[PDB]
Amino acid sequence: DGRIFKMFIEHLEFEKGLDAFSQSWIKALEDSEFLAILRLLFHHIVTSESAHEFAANGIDRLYKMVESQFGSGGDKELEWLIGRSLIQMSK
Amino acid sequence: DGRIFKMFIEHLEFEKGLDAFSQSWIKALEDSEFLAILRLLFHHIVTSESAHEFAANGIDRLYKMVESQFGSGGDKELEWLIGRSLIQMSK
Amino acid sequence: ADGRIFKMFIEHLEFEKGLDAFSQSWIKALEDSEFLAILRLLFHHIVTSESAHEFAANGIDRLYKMVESQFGSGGDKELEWLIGRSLIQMSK
Amino acid sequence: ADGRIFKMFIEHLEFEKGLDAFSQSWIKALEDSEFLAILRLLFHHIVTSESAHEFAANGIDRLYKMVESQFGSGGDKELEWLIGRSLIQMSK
Amino acid sequence: ADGRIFKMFIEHLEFEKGLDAFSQSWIKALEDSEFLAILRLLFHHIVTSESAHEFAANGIDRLYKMVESQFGSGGDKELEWLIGRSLIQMSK
Amino acid sequence: DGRIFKMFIEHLEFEKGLDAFSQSWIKALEDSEFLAILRLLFHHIVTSESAHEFAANGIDRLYKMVESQFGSGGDKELEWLIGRSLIQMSK
Known part of the structure; x- marks a missing residue:
């Protein structure tokens, strides 16, 4: 695992079913440091x-x-x- | 040395002791082209x-x-x- | 009011003295390494953000x-x- | 008022005709190379700044x-x- | 009102209790991996845009x-x- | 050719002489997705x-x-x- 991946994963709730998970992601997107992580996540895929x-x-x-x-x-x-x-x- | 490094160094005063040095750096940070250089300087270190x-x-x-x-x-x-x-x- | 980098760049160029005179200086400055490097930096700024x-x-x-x-x-x-x-x- | 890139992209998609119809077109457009490339570019824009x-x-x-x-x-x-x-x- | 990332970061630091106390906590936090990684991320944000x-x-x-x-x-x-x-x- | 290059080239008019070409480029610069392409184009050249x-x-x-x-x-x-x-x- 990444340092990054661990910390990313820690934003999200996996143990309480679809909605809890949704809530956590949605909530995280309110924190700009989280968006920055998500960018790292997508950086390579949007390459040609x-x-x-x-x-x-x-x-x-x-x-x-x-x-x-x-x-x-x-x-x-x-x-x-x-x-x-x-x-x-x-x- | 770099082309970049030479030019970077030329913003700063080394010959007149701590304060002159401080002054030059502080002064440089007023020029946005200088900030751009400083970014190059830090680019690698902030990588994981x-x-x-x-x-x-x-x-x-x-x-x-x-x-x-x-x-x-x-x-x-x-x-x-x-x-x-x-x-x-x-x- | 300008900053050290731009000042050194500006310095290579004739702004009094008319338009051709300006291109003239620009063309000449262009075979100077120092001018070319600073320009590349200036360029890099507006290209990379x-x-x-x-x-x-x-x-x-x-x-x-x-x-x-x-x-x-x-x-x-x-x-x-x-x-x-x-x-x-x-x-x- | 749009620009050539977006126009070509938009073109692959049904906006009249209802919501399913839209996803439908999107899903289909998705196996077209040209659509996929433009999307990747669009994506890349908002990911890289x-x-x-x-x-x-x-x-x-x-x-x-x-x-x-x-x-x-x-x-x-x-x-x-x-x-x-x-x-x-x-x-x- | 803060966000999970910053909260975990803040957590490593003494803000009550006085200024030295703060540097103190910062210096200590510094040999913790988790603190160091988050800082590097924070740094990376303001360095790369x-x-x-x-x-x-x-x-x-x-x-x-x-x-x-x-x-x-x-x-x-x-x-x-x-x-x-x-x-x-x-x-x- | 690139995927990118094809699409880039398609913004521009080559068949109708200097001015048509000028017009197309000038027109393209109005679309921000086009500027993004132009950045890709210049990315490497502005490197040191x-x-x-x-x-x-x-x-x-x-x-x-x-x-x-x-x-x-x-x-x-x-x-x-x-x-x-x-x-x-x-x-």
Whole structure:
């Protein structure tokens, strides 16, 4: 078992049937430290095989494909668009 | 040394004794780009041996244990509870 | 009013003196390691965490409100179930 | 008013036509790759970053305010020390 | 009004009884595994996500507003370009 | 290709020349699920060789260097400062 798992499990009531269990979970979701644990729990499942490749060479395929359709013209354009995207993430 | 470490260190005053040092750190904490560095600094230390296992097979132990106590009945229940948890994280 | 990191970054750039002059300095600063590293840090900040206005606008919450509006909390309770089933299927 | 990603997702689902009909469509959509991937992305969004209301409610800040309320900034200065010692011990 | 996690954590600590008494309990609690793990979790929360006030204050947005103020949206459009070029150079 | 990449690409118009392309990107940036994808895209590029070392032994070099300049005196001081930093991240 995890340290984490033990502590997670201790939030929940298993001995008193479906409703007691429900109550405990529902109650726990009121504590933000519990939500944080639940995130650890889901972290891996919401990951993609694809995602790692896409972060590893995605702008490269994207850059080639832009060049393919628009020529050097397109490089300057994509750069502008990406910058515009970072600016967007910062505001 | 890191690129990062050099730049980190450059925020701080080492040559003028405890208080000058204190002042510089305290002053730096006013700049949010500095806090970001400090996060890098602490990222690994706040990690758990446990945590990786828990993200890797935690819902599985959890799912079995639910079934153990409540039967098929419990599966439908846990699913509902997890969904309710994601909904919670989104609001 | 700025902070040490940004100050060192700003320092590499011409802001008086006109627009080309600015790009000019930026292009040049770009082959300096120190400039490049700080930028990467600045970038990393806005890439690795998100604005609250952005977050509040996620699909899961849009979804939740369509379901509700249409089916009330009964639908919420069901959507909640479906979401759970899906997330489980995603691990299996 | 929605966005391309959510639109494609929504598209897989029956919202007219009643509640069962909805779960029905959801269950079916679930063996379609495209639906499953988008959901995983939607999920990933709300799993890998946090609401401001949620964050403001962390334990460290609760802790900080108990300490303060009870011992004033003198206690803050001490708690701050203890926290540091702990974090160091956690690396050692 | 607190939550199970924090309650168990709080439990290890003397808050009546005076300031030394508090550090005392903290120092002692520190060689207990359970205390140490929960703290690490608490820590991890505030290390792995950020306050909105903190985020709103990033350098990229400072930068953006200097550029604008000085060169208007024309400058924005240019800065945007430069930022793109840089980010590309960072992958190459 | 990625699952992700396909879906990313589907936001954008390539067949109708620079402006149509611009329009589509600009339009996409209005959807927060799209920004999330763009983050995946940039995640790796904004990473540092340095950063990993700095998270792996940075407080250690920092701790030594403090001791070097200030003696045992400095340990108690650095601890206080770090704590003060976590407190700061939590408010």
